[PDB]
Amino acid sequence: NMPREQLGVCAEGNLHSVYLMFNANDNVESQLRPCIANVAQYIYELTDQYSDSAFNGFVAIGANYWDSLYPESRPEMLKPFPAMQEGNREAPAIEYDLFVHLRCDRYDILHLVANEISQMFEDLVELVEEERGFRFMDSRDLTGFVDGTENPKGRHRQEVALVGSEDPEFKGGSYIHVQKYAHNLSKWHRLPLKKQEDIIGRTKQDNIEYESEDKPLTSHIKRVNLKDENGKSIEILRQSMPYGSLKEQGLMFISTCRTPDHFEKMLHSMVFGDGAGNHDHLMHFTSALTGSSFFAPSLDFLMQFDN
Amino acid sequence: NMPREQLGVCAEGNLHSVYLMFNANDNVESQLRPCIANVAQYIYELTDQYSDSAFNGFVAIGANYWDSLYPESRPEMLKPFPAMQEGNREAPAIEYDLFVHLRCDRYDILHLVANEISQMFEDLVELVEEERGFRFMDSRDLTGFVDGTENPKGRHRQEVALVGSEDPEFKGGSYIHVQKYAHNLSKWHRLPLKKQEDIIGRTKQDNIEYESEDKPLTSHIKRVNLKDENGKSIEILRQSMPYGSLKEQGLMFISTCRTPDHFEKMLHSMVFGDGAGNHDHLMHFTSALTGSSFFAPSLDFLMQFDN
């Protein structure tokens, strides 16, 4: 095929990340489109320049902003973040016009690049939120359990994450959902090991999946690992990482996917649960403060704009 | 001698740091004293546990809080932060009751430890400020110039930093000053190289010291490298590091020293200058938002309190 995916939609894991949310100023579209193409290209080229430290990243566009920037066409299924709630379980929507996702095994390099990208946007946008994520131990969440075990590996990563010829104009791109989960860690780490393990549905140290006959229905793994009409695995490609500091810490949940309703189906099954009353009790211990829908176009889509 | 310095007052440099400022709640002294001894000891022991990643750190006590915690005696020369100002050049004082300084070549470990220390203080204190620093390239400031070149090395580090038998009760300790400098990086990086270099008094890449005959009097190096009545070098041991994010970034200036007026003399010579009108023009490009005075006692001083 023709169009190239932005690297870092599907990159393997890194030690450090930078997450930037910009909102655009008024009537800046004429100038922002090419300015984005610049930044995307910058990010792509940097993968080579900083291969030393596995640099990769991408730029993605807010669902509620897309029509302003690129009014001539859309990704078929692009939709706002699917906010939900019931009881103390909220998944709110806070959308942002632009998302810049930077990953590297060195922090200083990410800092440099972040500055450079900011300086690139000039006075066209405003940084609303910034968060920096990190690998915690051997790819563990601050909860102490391994994250991303169930992620697809190999060429299957692209198969799951990237739009194919089902929407040829946007082939190469990916529907990106993001939730900033704030863990209540003191509440969590007061659970005895087995309660922790029964909540997640795997052993903590060796990260061993429970026999399905033992998986509680309220467990995270039971609740998030799903299957379509035909019992085929409904998959996403998580690029999530721990983030934050004492003031507030947890997991930057980042979903990348061919379709944006693979994420929906899963979020629904956590919040509202299985229809028989069992929801994801992991939500008793963490709070999604934000929820955002983007599309990360292929590099080539972005680049067709001077003007 | 007897008393052991907290490691990390004099540690060699690391890749990552965590800086924590706590203020104490009302009338918590009885319980906080031993609780500190715990945390100091924790930090000391962790140097062994995490020698893999060169972990080190220390706990230091705010000058304005010391008499509350340790009313029975003081370090001879302990004094508040010496606030100064003239023109757009301010060095303000913002004091904090307690300072926890954590360093490691791994970030995840620092995160863990920071959480653990917080959980240790229970409800005795409140985290006021947190900042995380990092090594930027080969020990460079975000300004792009090498930092800490003029630092003492070897056993001389202790000679400079640590109180000796001139105040035997507090031997092993160190007077610690801290300023959070916020760089105006866009203003800085619009200077041509030679203006940058003339401002600092060394070459940028190779970091070559100017011949004294060429050092402008307004240069940082000229202005900070001083000598007593007898032309002997007035020294400190900097443990400074870059910090921050797009919202605000710069240098966490951290001075450690036998006496607290080595730092003063230097800060004075930057702000008010040389008496003939020449001040440190590096201050045209960065702003000290905070300034804090502490003493980091020897481990053994801290530990003499149960109760």
Side-chain angles (χ1 to χ4, degrees), chain A residues 16 20 22 50 106-109 111-112 114-116 118-119 127-130 132 134-138 142 185-187 189-190 243-247 249, chain B residues 16 20 22 50 106-109 111-112 114-116 118-119 127-130 132 134-138 142 185-187 189-190 243-247 249:
Chain A
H16 294 111
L20 306 175
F22 301 93
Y50 290 135
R106 289 178 49 168
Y107 190 112
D108 55 1
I109 278 159
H111 190 92
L112 175 65
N115 282 339
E116 185 64 46
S118 159
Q119 207 144 32
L127 177 74
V128 190
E129 307 297 331
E130 166 157 26
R132 305 201 166 188
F134 56 94
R135 178 179 298 170
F136 182 64
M137 315 309 207
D138 49 321
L142 295 175
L185 283 179
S186 47
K187 183 178 177 173
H189 287 296
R190 306 205 71 174
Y243 85 99
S245 92
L246 291 167
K247 312 196 188 216
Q249 62 195 294
Chain B
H16 294 111
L20 306 175
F22 301 93
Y50 290 135
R106 289 178 49 168
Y107 190 112
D108 55 1
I109 278 159
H111 190 92
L112 175 65
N115 282 339
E116 185 64 46
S118 159
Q119 207 144 32
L127 177 74
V128 190
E129 307 297 331
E130 166 157 26
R132 305 201 166 188
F134 56 94
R135 178 179 298 170
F136 182 64
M137 315 309 207
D138 49 321
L142 295 175
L185 283 179
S186 47
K187 183 178 177 173
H189 287 296
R190 306 205 71 174
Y243 85 99
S245 92
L246 291 167
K247 312 196 188 216
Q249 62 195 294

Side-chain angles (χ1 to χ4, degrees), chain B residues 261-264 266-304:
Chain B
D261 64 75
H262 277 198
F263 170 82
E264 260 197 61
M266 293 181 178
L267 182 63
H268 182 105
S269 95
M270 285 174 60
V271 179
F272 295 103
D274 70 347
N278 298 297
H279 61 274
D280 186 6
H281 285 205
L282 173 54
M283 298 192 74
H284 297 169
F285 300 93
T286 191
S287 309
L289 310 179
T290 65
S292 302
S293 171
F294 313 85
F295 192 80
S298 74
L299 177 57
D300 298 63
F301 175 81
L302 290 169
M303 266 186 41
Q304 67 192 306

